[PDB]
Amino acid sequence: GNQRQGVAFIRVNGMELESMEGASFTPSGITREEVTGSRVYGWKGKPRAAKVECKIPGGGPIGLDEIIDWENITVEFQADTGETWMLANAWQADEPKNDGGEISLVLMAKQSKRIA
Amino acid sequence: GNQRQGVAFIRVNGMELESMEGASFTPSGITREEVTGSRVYGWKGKPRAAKVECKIPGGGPIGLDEIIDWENITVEFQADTGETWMLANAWQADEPKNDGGEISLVLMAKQSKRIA
Amino acid sequence: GNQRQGVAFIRVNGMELESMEGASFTPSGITREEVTGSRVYGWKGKPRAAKVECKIPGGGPIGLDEIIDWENITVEFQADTGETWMLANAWQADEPKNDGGEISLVLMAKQSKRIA
Amino acid sequence: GNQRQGVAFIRVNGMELESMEGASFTPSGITREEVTGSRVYGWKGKPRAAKVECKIPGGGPIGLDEIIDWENITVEFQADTGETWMLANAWQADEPKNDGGEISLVLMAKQSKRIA
Amino acid sequence: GNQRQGVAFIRVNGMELESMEGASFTPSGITREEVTGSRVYGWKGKPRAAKVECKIPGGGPIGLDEIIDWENITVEFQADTGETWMLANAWQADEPKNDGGEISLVLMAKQSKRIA
Amino acid sequence: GNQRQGVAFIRVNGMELESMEGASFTPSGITREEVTGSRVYGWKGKPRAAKVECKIPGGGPIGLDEIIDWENITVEFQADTGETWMLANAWQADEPKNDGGEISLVLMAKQSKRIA
Amino acid sequence: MLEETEAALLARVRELFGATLRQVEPLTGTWTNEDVHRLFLAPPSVFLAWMGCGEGRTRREVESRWAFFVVAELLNGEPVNRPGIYQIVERLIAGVNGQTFGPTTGMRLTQVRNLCDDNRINAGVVLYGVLFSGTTPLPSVVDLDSLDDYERHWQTWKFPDETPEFAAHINVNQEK
Amino acid sequence: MLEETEAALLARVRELFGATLRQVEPLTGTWTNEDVHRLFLAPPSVFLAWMGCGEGRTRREVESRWAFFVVAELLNGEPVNRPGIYQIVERLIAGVNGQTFGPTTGMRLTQVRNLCDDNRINAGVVLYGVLFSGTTPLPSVVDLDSLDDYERHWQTWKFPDETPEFAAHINVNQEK
Amino acid sequence: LRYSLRTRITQKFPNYKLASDGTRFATGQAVVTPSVIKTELLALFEEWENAGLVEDFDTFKEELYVARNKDDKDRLDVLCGPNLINQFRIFAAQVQFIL
């Protein structure tokens, strides 16, 4: 109780990635857009891939080469409240830009399972 | 009197979702665009779906898996003044991004009735 | 019996530092903050770094260069009443300045442990 | 007859905290604010959490670690005139600091009830 | 330890270019976008060229003519922590705009090697 | 024995400047700052310029024009206890003003050397 | 807790100085214009005098103001041992600064008054006087202890005086 | 470290003024209303008097307040050498400003009082008085030195008094 | 009320040991200071206040007087205002029409 989540831990193969202020998560599932004509006509389904965004301060143990060479890893998004999602067979997307000592990073996977 | 609305309670199946500062409502009806030729020529009708945009602090009783698994729910947007709209057979839309400890969420339904 | 804190001793590497007054210790922990929405929900956490700020005479045996080159030291804040805290691997923050024989040291560390 | 407030007692878990001067109590409720447009209309509500600001001597029998580990406590603000308020499941806010044998505690709670 | 990157040195043929507050690096490799159909269906590969974006104060030893006439150089992005990438056979891109005494400049190459 | 800093002497080009009270010296180095994310990680560096803030009586033999034309000088901050610092190729910062027979000089240099 | 603090200061002074100071003795009142002709000075010696106490931070602590009046002899306008008296003053300041003495803690030096006027110069006495302030707490409420076997609970309902009385004499621990 | 400081100021005054000042001598106590009829003035001369020490920045330093009482002669309502006395006061201020004097450093001028009421005018003396404040440190803790061979370690477990004793007489450096 | 309070006192506090209010009794030790009995009586008053029958509560708290029998021992002298509830019997209403 009274433990509203405000801080999150990123973990990659049990390494507890150093994440900065802004950590974001989107669980995998179905994106539910609109299909409306004359009437509202319900909704329409669309697949969605699980995506976790985190900024890493540079110079840490991980480095940037290991980031760019990540193709098959198991990542975990743990919430201080206890919300712990798991992503199997993940991979880093977009460009890992190293701006101002910060490593902008996004990790994406095809399945998100809430464990514990 | 002197009860101008500043805070709104969102409820799903009688659970009173934990909502944050920004809660938005758009009742279902007709979106009234214009068709104008040489003269103004009145307006044109277009259907609209009821929409409730709310931000939920993470780690609460509601969770995020229950959010992404909502396909058929009954929503109730109650205003502190007393205006209480109701949506039957709703569904979560867009991506429920878990950014910065906040669960951005939008709930959409094909009908909105002003009850009480 | 119910003795209160009087003087506070600031030590670096097991050696006393001359502190004038108001040498403040802030423990390492979480800064619980409000989460206000439709109603009051609870509190949100945010990690902190333990921090000792103390004022030292300039030109002393300690020297200004040794102060500005303190990348890794082991600070200890000891209350004369008996309780003492130790900073694990602290470093000098802020911008040191020798203004009128006065220097302010903000030694900040990842964690503070209540030893002894 | 028309007695006024003198000293205020701040208790946690049924035990006094030595509050030096000017202990502050803000009740939990709604913070009504003006709503001005074409003309003045009324007032707008916004939920608020109860707050107690008390200053404690440092190094006391209470200790600093026990203070900074107060996630769930039951605070009581008692006015010597007779009226007292109790905080339901209060927690320590702000950033505690033991400056010069002095610590400031902002014990913030979801609700305050006028018991006794 | 405790050496999170905040400042980086850019070097061009052993010149240590004068950099500004924000320096950005993107190592060469493969950009991993989405290839999503009915299911997530994994990801898709795409080549990426290594890029270093930096701002230079005008009037330095380097000058702007030498900037605009750089066609075959080997640059080195060194981190204060120690992460030292090198780009062989580099070339400057975009418009070296001389705005407000600052040289907005970007240098990119086809290979990025992390040396030492 | 344990002598402490008393009066501080400000010299330019091997000539004393009449500094009234509280002459301030900030050494050149790195201004370490906290790096807070999911948890506290370490410290972040940032280059800093050495700075001497002194106050000179107006209308003196030094003259205001000679002060405002100090593009390249060699400042020396000498503590009476013995330690002295020299500014290699310092220049006048800030906006000099001869208000009330008083002028403030902020002489800033790339780095300060612990000579003598 | 003041007398304990006073005893602690006296013991500390005795340990620090020993035979250097001829005697140490708490002095009633502050130094007046008659104390020189009234006391058994026996210089060199120091007297610890409580100068009261101002309001502390809390309602359970005060800022006690103590004083160390140092005495010596100035025969023929010459201090008996000027290095000795200066060393005594400095060592008394150093050993009784910051360090706790019983319940009182944070002894802070406040003033060192010369306090050597004609009344003492003509009497062959220097009276360098140190002053101190300390955060001393107040005694706690005296505890209690008693055990009586609970056996009877007399309750009376407060009806009007001449209304027939209503009461219950429970007399607990009764079995039947 | 006050006595060393006052010796430093006296030596500095002697070096600066030499034979211009007839004598220099420390003064016991601040200048009262009878010092004129009690001292061997022999004007012109200057007296260094310690006026005490206010609280310093730390618990190891204090702000010592010294005073320079300058004396001369005013025969027939006329100073003996007004340029001389003004130069004496001025050079005393200049040469004892900022410069360190032993442990004390940062000598800052604080006040200069004319300090010539009727008592000194009818006594034919001017008493221009300078004041100074300096950051003087307190003496350090006295060191120690001793070397005794460690041979025995006697430990006694604190059991109840009449409970049979438990102890270990270790006696290190024993070989067998 | 007498029945309920007799039951409560005879069940909740058998073989206990009363003590002065300032006593340093442990958490589990069977000790009932006057303050403990006062708080228990107020809680019990609330227990038969939820189910009516005692109307006011504040005046009961102020007028409640639980003391140790200074003469002799082993007797809590308890003086409590009954604060009994009243029954809605007669309704009196004046219309005073304003027209």
Residue numbers in the entry:
A (entry chain d), B (entry chain c), C (entry chain a), D (entry chain X), E (entry chain S), F (entry chain T): 3 to 118
G (entry chain F), H (entry chain A): 1 to 176
I (entry chain Q): 396 to 494
Wording from the paper:
Myophage Mu is a representative of contractile nanomachines with a simple tail baseplate. It has the capacity to infect a range of intestinal bacteria and has extensive applications in genetic engineering research. Using cryo-EM, we resolved the three-dimensional (3D) structures of the G(+) type phage Mu in both its extended state and urea-induced contracted state, the latter lacking the baseplate, at near-atomic resolutions. The structure of extended Mu can be divided into four distinct regions: the DNA-containing head, the connector complex, the tail, and the baseplate.
The absence of baseplate density in the contracted tail indicates that the baseplate may have detached during the process of tail contraction, potentially due to the effects of excessive urea induction. The terminator protein gp37 remains unaltered in both states, with the exception of the C-terminal β-hairpin domain. Upon contraction, the flexible C-terminal β-hairpin domain of gp37 elongates in conjunction with the domain I of the last layer of the tail sheath protein gp39, thereby accommodating sheath expansion. In the tail, the tube protein gp40 does not undergo any conformational change. However, the sheath protein gp39 undergoes significant conformational changes in both states. A structural comparison of the extended and contracted sheath monomers reveals that the N- and C-terminal arms of gp39 undergo significant conformational changes, indicating that each gp39 monomer primarily undergoes a rigid-body rotation, mediated by its N- and C-terminal arms, upon contraction. The contracted sheath retains the four-stranded β-sheet arrangement of all gp39 monomers, but the helical rise decreases from approximately 35 Å to approximately 19 Å, and the helical twist increases from approximately 25° to approximately 33°. The outer diameter of the sheath ring increases from 195 Å to 260 Å, and the inner pore diameter expands from 79 Å to 92 Å, which is sufficient to break the contacts between the tail sheath and tube. This process enables the sheath to be detached from the tube, resulting in the sheath becoming more compact and contracting, and the tail tube becoming exposed.
